[PDB]
Amino acid sequence: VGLDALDAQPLLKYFQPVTQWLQEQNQQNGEVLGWPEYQWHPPLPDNYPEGIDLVTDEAEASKFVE
Amino acid sequence: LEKIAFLPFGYLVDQWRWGVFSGRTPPSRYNFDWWYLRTKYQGICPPVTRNETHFDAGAKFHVPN
Amino acid sequence: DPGLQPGNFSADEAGAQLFAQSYNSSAEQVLFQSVAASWAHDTNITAENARRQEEAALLSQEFAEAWGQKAKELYEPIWQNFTDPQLRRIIGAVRTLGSANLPLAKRQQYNALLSNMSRIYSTAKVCLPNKTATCWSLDPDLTNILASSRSYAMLLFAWEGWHNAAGIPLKPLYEDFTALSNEAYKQDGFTDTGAYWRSWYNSPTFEDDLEHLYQQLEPLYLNLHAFVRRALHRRYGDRYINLRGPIPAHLLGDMWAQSWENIYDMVVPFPDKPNLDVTSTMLQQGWNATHMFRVAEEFFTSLELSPMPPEFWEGSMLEKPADGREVVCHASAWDFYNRKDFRIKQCTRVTMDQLSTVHHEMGHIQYYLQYKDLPVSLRRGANPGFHEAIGDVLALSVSTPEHLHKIGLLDRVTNDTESDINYLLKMALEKIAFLPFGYLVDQWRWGVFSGRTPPSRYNFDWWYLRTKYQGICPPVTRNETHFDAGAKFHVPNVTPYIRYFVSFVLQFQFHEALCKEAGYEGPLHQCDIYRSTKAGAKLRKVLQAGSSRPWQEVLKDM
Ligand SMILES: *[C@@H]1O[C@H](CO)[C@@H](O[C@@H]2O[C@H](CO)[C@@H](O[C@@H]3O[C@H](CO)[C@@H](O)[C@H](O)[C@@H]3O)[C@H](O)[C@H]2NC(C)=O)[C@H](O)[C@H]1NC(C)=O
Ligand SMILES: *[C@@H]1O[C@H](CO)[C@@H](O[C@@H]2O[C@H](CO)[C@@H](O[C@@H]3O[C@H](CO)[C@@H](O)[C@H](O)[C@@H]3O)[C@H](O)[C@H]2NC(C)=O)[C@H](O)[C@H]1NC(C)=O
Ligand SMILES: *[C@@H]1O[C@H](CO)[C@@H](O[C@@H]2O[C@H](CO)[C@@H](O)[C@H](O)[C@H]2NC(C)=O)[C@H](O)[C@H]1NC(C)=O
Ligand SMILES: *[C@@H]1O[C@H](CO)[C@@H](O[C@@H]2O[C@H](CO)[C@@H](O)[C@H](O)[C@H]2NC(C)=O)[C@H](O)[C@H]1NC(C)=O
Ligand SMILES: *[C@@H]1O[C@H](CO)[C@@H](O[C@@H]2O[C@H](CO)[C@@H](O)[C@H](O)[C@H]2NC(C)=O)[C@H](O)[C@H]1NC(C)=O
Ligand SMILES: *[C@@H]1O[C@H](CO)[C@@H](O[C@@H]2O[C@H](CO)[C@@H](O)[C@H](O)[C@H]2NC(C)=O)[C@H](O)[C@H]1NC(C)=O
Ligand SMILES: *[C@@H]1O[C@H](CO)[C@@H](O)[C@H](O)[C@H]1NC(C)=O
């Protein structure tokens, strides 16, 4: 390749347009990069141990309603 | 989303294994160090409350084998 | 000032010796003025002696940076090659400019940031929701409230309020300060500021040795933590304390959970017999408010130690301030220097704690006395923890009941296993509970400096270390908005904190070595070094060399 050790430059140059699009989309959406509130844990689903076999798919719901 | 999403895990797993081998992680901070690394590098939080009875590093194939 | 301007020196060995002698001949006076103006700051006795300290500190800073610039521009290969210890020590000490390597604007910003951090820590207040005309400060309101009130809600309110108030406005200043310090000490020659701080200890394997040392001390802290957690679970119930998980970092002792002394109220092993905490016997014997220092001096003289110069009893105040708004209370012993004399400046009371502190500061004065013959740069005693270790081994030897009985403060020795266990646990709630701390704090600061902790991972790494080593969970859910490391006093005021850990480790080693040397091969509690001239001679021999040789060699000697 012409370089001794590893480098992230070819990878960064590879994903340049998708990185630019992601940056612009994140700026538009008003998001915060990274994860503050690191000690956040999601709650258990209501009636978790025996409530797993319940369909919660949007496409299935729309098809059933129609 | 196939590769960039993977890079932290590759940086993470062998870092945890190095810590365990070097003695910095005794057999009482296995899950603690593992999930600290998972939250620090990958931004992933455990869904259920995991404590020291669990060993959530043997779930990966490359740790036992 | 022509005295502050360096002269001429050559690259020859005689030239380096001339540099060392000239540094003596100038820095002696410079440190005289600095320490005199330092004494002048007794809580603004006249409100102008404070600005005299400020001007003398600037006066010393300019001279130090000038001498260091001369040494850097003239003495690189001498630092690289020459081998005897004293000249290497002198040249290394003069070579490090510290914050003097930055440009004028950057250095001014650095000093302004340091003063900013110190001030914003000092004047941080906690106000109740009703916004009463009074607002709590850290001293003496918040500390007393946290060390006295056994109310979960009040303790939590005080803890969270102080941590928020003293940490949230301290984040950007600390980030900029870390950047500036890293730049300055990278220009100095070290890879980072943390490397500079570790370089005082002269050990390539300092971190590994420290980790092994803490791994050796783990079971003691584990048992103590389990016992205190059981007591707290009995007191505060089961909802707020988990019998398996950690304990919240407000329910014990101080605000930062470094010392657990205030827990000893509810965790006593044997409460049937009274503990040895007596002050009436001192007053019945008719002690002075100053004769405690005199009996400490005669105790030193007994084992042929501390030939105290008379200037202390004429120019050193050992009492509370009778007149003038002098110091309220601190734990320092400023030296007159002069190449002649020193001084104690402390508070006097009737409790045994004051007597132990008096013995500690007399030991510090003894440390100052022994290395006077050494050059100016060889004033610090080897390892920066040596000062505290030497000043605390004597206090350990003094606080024993046998010492008090043999020196008249106690009618007779209380030889009971229950009393020994009570005293051991009382002293193990500050000399063991602090051991995870210090190590924890300086590991966090090393990580922050080295770049392993970016400004977006301050609280995360801090609380990971707190739960890992100390093992205390935050009662309120924190996040990266908070800066909980800035609540500690030593984080804004830039001061290393591993010295206390090293000294706590070292004082027991010195105590054991002296006890084995003293010829008393028994339990280590009642092992006072009274009336043992050989132990005094050995301690004097070790105390003679201050930074003259690496601390490892002195430790091997002792
Ligand atoms: C470090 O610097 C100080 C200050 O320059 C030096 O202290 C001074 O050392 C000289 C000898 O080099 C002392 O003079 C001697 O004092 C006694 C008087 O009874 C006696 O031994 C000799 O007759 C001689 O006069 C001097 O008192 C002392 N202090 C001052 C204020 O000048 C010190 O020597 C330097 N250290 C090194 C290692 O160079
Ligand atoms: C940290 O230190 C900086 C200095 O590097 C402090 O900056 C200070 O900023 C205030 C305003 O925020 C300045 O007050 C001045 O007052 C008058 C108002 O008419 C006028 O001269 C200026 O427009 C300005 O507002 C102040 O001079 C400036 N410097 C100092 C030394 O205080 C900053 O306040 C410090 N941080 C904190 C949290 O206090
Ligand atoms: C979710 O609700 C929205 C309305 O808030 C739905 O949008 C419309 O839904 C109706 C049926 O209720 C469809 O006929 C329309 O075509 C939908 N509008 C559009 C613009 O698509 C939406 O379909 C619902 N989605 C799901 C997944 O349930
Ligand atoms: C320290 O103690 C001595 C006595 O040991 C003090 O001398 C005072 O003089 C009277 C004379 O009858 C003694 O009985 C008292 O005990 C002393 N008065 C006090 C302590 O108030 C001596 O003044 C003391 N030294 C000081 C205060 O520097
Ligand atoms: C306080 O009590 C302990 C026992 O709990 C004493 O231990 C002594 O130990 C030595 C050997 O190390 C024996 O020869 C003694 O007989 C023990 N003394 C007893 C049992 O009374 C310890 O020495 C006592 N401390 C003091 C200062 O006397
Ligand atoms: C970190 O947690 C703190 C404490 O809950 C959050 O601070 C509160 O934020 C809300 C929403 O912005 C405000 O209404 C409150 O006034 C804040 N309270 C205090 C005491 O500051 C903070 O927002 C959290 N930060 C992040 C990045 O999630
Ligand atoms: C020695 O250095 C000083 C620095 O102040 C300088 O003034 C002087 O000229 C120099 N002398 C010689 C002989 O190099």
H or E element in which residue C233 lies: helix C218-236
| Structure determination technique employed | cryo-EM
Question: Token pair 């990278």 is at which residue?
Answer: C186
CB contact under 8 A, A41 and B46: yes
* DSSP state for residue C139 in the 8-state scheme: I
Cβ neighbours, 10 Å, residue C522: 8
Report d(CA A36, CA C454) in Å as an integer.
13
Closest C-alpha among C356, C367, C374 to residue C389: C367
Rounded to 5°, the CA angle C154-C160-C165 comes to 125
Give the distance (Å) from ligand 4 centre to CA of residue C285: 12
CB contact under 8 A, A39 and C478: yes
Residues paired with residue C136 on neighbouring β-strands, in sequence order: C126
Closest Cβ opposite residue B47 in set A15, A34, A42? A42
Structure token digits, residue C248: 């919240």
Instruction: Flag whether C364 is marked binding.
Output: yes
Long-range pairs of C273-278 with CB within 8 A, sequence gap ≥ 24: C273/C416, C273/C418, C273/C419, C273/C422, C275/C419, C275/C422, C275/C423, C275/C426, C276/C401, C276/C404, C276/C410, C276/C414, C276/C419, C276/C423, C277/C352, C278/C352, C278/C410
- As a dihedral over the C-alpha atoms of residue C236, residue C240, residue C246, residue C250, rounded to 10 degrees, the angle is -70
- What is chain A's Cα-based Rg? 22
C388 belongs to an annotated ligand binding site: yes
Please say whether the dihedral angle defined by the alpha carbons of residues C514, C518, C524 and C529, taken in this order, is positive or negative. negative
Whether A34 sits inside 8 A of C481 (CB atoms) is no
- Which of B4, B43, B45 lies at the smallest CB-CB distance from A41? B45
Asked whether the CA dihedral C212, C217, C223, C226 is positive or negative, the reply is: negative
> Residue C133 is encoded by which pair of tokens?
């005309």
Nearest-angstrom CA–CA distance, C558 and C532: 16
Greatest alpha-carbon pair distance for chain C in Å reads 74
Give me C191's structure tokens.
Answer: 């890879």
> d(Cα C517, Cα C511) in Å, to the nearest integer?
10
Nearest to A35 among B43, B46, B49 (CB): B43
> Quick one: which of B41, B34, B39 has its CA closest to B58?
B34
What is the CA(C51)–ligand 2 centre distance, in A? 20
Using an 8 Å CB-CB cutoff, list chain B residues near A40. Answer: 45
Euclidean distance between CA atoms C162 and C159, whole angstroms: 5
Which residue, C203, C134, C139, is CA-closest to C166? Answer: C139
- Inter-chain CB pairs, A–B, below 8 Å: 12
Q: Give the chains touching A; criterion: ≥3 Cβ pairs < 8 Å.
A: B, C
User: DSSP letter at A30?
Assistant: T
CB atoms A15 and B4 under 8 Å: yes
CA distance linking residue A39 with residue C461, whole number of Å: 12
B4 and A41 within 8 Å at the Cβ level: the answer is: no
Contacts of A47 (CB under 8 A, 6+ apart): none
8 A C-beta contact, residue C85 and residue C202: no
Contact A40 B46 (CB under 8 A): no
Evaluate whether C341 touches C309 at the Cβ level (below 8 Å): yes
d(CA C171, CA C162): 15
Residue C373 makes CB contacts below 8 A (sequence gap 6+) with none
C297 HSE (CA, 13 A, CB side): 15
- Ligand 4 atom at minimal distance to the Cα of residue C313: 28
Which amino acid, C115? S
Q: Rounded to an integer, what distance in angstroms lies between the CA atom of residue C175 and that of residue C189? A: 21
Name all contacts of C109-116 with Cβ < 8 Å and 24+ positions apart: C109/C176, C109/C180, C110/C177, C110/C180, C110/C181, C110/C184, C113/C173, C113/C176, C113/C177, C113/C180, C114/C177, C114/C494, C116/C173
Cis peptide before C140 (omega within 30 of 0): yes
User: Does the CB atom of residue C375 touch ligand 1 within 6 A?
Assistant: yes
From C407, C414, C415, C524, give the residue whose CB has the most ligand 5 atoms within 8 Å, as the site to mutate. Answer: C415
Provide the 3-class DSSP secondary structure of residue C346: strand
Q: At what angle do helices C49-74 and C85-95 cross, to 10 degrees?
A: 120
Smallest CA-to-CA distance from B32 within B55, B9, B14, B64 is with B55
CA distance A62 to chain B (A): 28
Beta-bridge mates of residue C341 = C337
Q: At what angle do helices C85-95 and C13-40 cross, to 10 degrees?
A: 60
Owner of token pair 């960064």: A12
**C201 labeled binding residue:** yes
Name the residue with tokens 């820095």.
Answer: C27
Report whether B47 contacts B53 (CB < 8 A): no
Q: Whose CA is nearest to atom 4 of ligand 5?
A: C417
Breaks (C-N over 2.5 A) in chain A follow: none
Write the DSSP assignment of B1-65 as a string of letters: --STTTHHHHHHHHHHHHHHHHTSS-TTSHHHHHHHHIIIII----SS---TT--TTSSSTTTT-
Distance of CA C57 to the CA centre of its chain: 21
Report the number of secondary-structure helices (H) and strands (E) in chain A: 3, 0
* Cβ–ligand 5 contact at C415 (below 6 Å): yes
* H/E segment holding residue C351: none
Of C34, C31, C35, the closest CA to residue C332 belongs to C35
Query: How many other CB atoms are there within 10 angstroms of residue A60's CB atom?
Result: 10
* Element of type H or E holding C405: helix C401-407
Chain breaks in chain B (C to N over 2.5 A) after: none
3-state DSSP call for residue C137?
Answer: strand
Write phi, then psi, for C429 (nearest 5 degrees): -90, -5
| Distance from the alpha carbon of residue A65 to the mean position of ligand 3, in angstroms | 11
C19 CA to centre of ligand 7 in angstroms:
13
Residue C524 Cβ inside 6 Å of ligand 5? The answer reads: no
Q: How far apart are CA C2 and CA C68, in angstroms?
A: 16
For the beta carbon of residue C42, count every other beta carbon within 10 angstroms. Answer: 18
Q: Say how many C-beta atoms besides its own lie within 10 A of residue C429's C-beta.
A: 20
Q: How far is CA B38 from CA A42, B16, B35, B42, B46, in A?
A: 16, 10, 5, 5, 9
C106: tokens are 């950057």
| CA-A62 nearest atom, ligand 3 | 28
CA-based R_g, chain C, Å? 25
